[PDB]
Design a binder for these strands. Sequence first.
DNA 1: ATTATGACGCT
DNA 2: AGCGTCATA
Length: 430
Amino acid sequence: GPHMATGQDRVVALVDMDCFFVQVEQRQNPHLRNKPCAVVQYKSWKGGGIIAVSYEARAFGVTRSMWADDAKKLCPDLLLAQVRESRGKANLTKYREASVEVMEIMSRFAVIERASIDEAYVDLTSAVQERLQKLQGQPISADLLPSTYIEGLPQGPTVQKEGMRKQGLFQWLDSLQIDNLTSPDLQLTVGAVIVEEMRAAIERETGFQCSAGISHNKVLAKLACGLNKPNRQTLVSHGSVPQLFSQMPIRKIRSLGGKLGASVIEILGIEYMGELTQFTESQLQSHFGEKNGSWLYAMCRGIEHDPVKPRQLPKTIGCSKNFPGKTALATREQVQWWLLQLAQELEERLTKDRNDNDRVATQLVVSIRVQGDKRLSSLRRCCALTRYDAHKMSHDAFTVIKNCNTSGIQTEWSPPLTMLFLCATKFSAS
DNA sequence: ATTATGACGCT
DNA sequence: AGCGTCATA
Ligand SMILES: [Ca+2]
Ligand SMILES: [Mn+2]
Ligand SMILES: [Mn+2]
């Protein structure tokens, strides 16, 4: 009891842009606003592949990974925006630059960890402490939380969605002990006040809407964020975890969506996160290893210690292209032309990176896939990256992979290449 | 014939 | 180092 940690020491938020590439395109083209619409890459093959979908289009059943031609069968009036093509490939620069807009605003409030192109974690523990001393034991008004859900409320002894949200928020605020500067629930609440402010700033200054989760760690904050999308934020308290987890499929928790989560389910014969509490730490470590076992033991109790890392910039800069089915690269000059295309985009992004961020990459990673291999990558080789020159990088890439060519004819490439990948890594200050 | 990424774990 | 896992638009 007295010595049992509860993982309530931090306030952590996760901010995730709603339908992000779609919002980037809707800001640019007002005709797409408030419409079923999606973002697609390429066209020729089945109308192109969908990579983002507006909430209006989701109502028709449109999803990511859908071919646009198939999406049009569900939603005939679906509007589409295409990813830019440069040097024969999709080019995601517009969305990377829009990401920077948002990340720079968030950084004004706190240290952030860039977790994807459209989301970052925030450690708000310090900011909350400051805001609490500004508040002077003064109660938090519902007006300060106009888009916040309190997960698990209302409960106990109106049929509209916004009405339910306010009911829950009222119950929460009615219970709050604002006289205690160290109450975790109060700290989360002030955290939510700050995230309302952050989200207002993002929308004001970019036009983009986002959702957010506020909790005591990254996993709960990420989970919370998704609970009420779009354009809303959700507070998941330590106390809300047993009920939340009692019906929460294991695969919904970050890092458990794949093989490990499948094994937790199969080996233990359970379905929900909460069911993990019935195993000892040693039992979990026996099945899933020392690190995963300890992580699972604490996580199913709502506790996790992974820090919000102070990193706003990506650690690698990469440029990849698939060559599916019949477009697979079967000649040396094909291979060399596409290495150059990739290397030219890589040089452009690397040079911009060096100017913006005062750093230089020092290692070039080259990866290919061969036709037939089920694995995404077949072969990965590194070499020195000593100069930002596309022709040098592409010549070097060819050198490190050219021995993969089984063909007795050096003119021909076999087995044909179905993927090329160039990645700059190992940055040093400059 | 989802594709284009990007972080981190294992040995 | 090279490979695998898991994640996001
Ligand atoms: Ca998003
Ligand atoms: Mn996201
Ligand atoms: Mn998504």
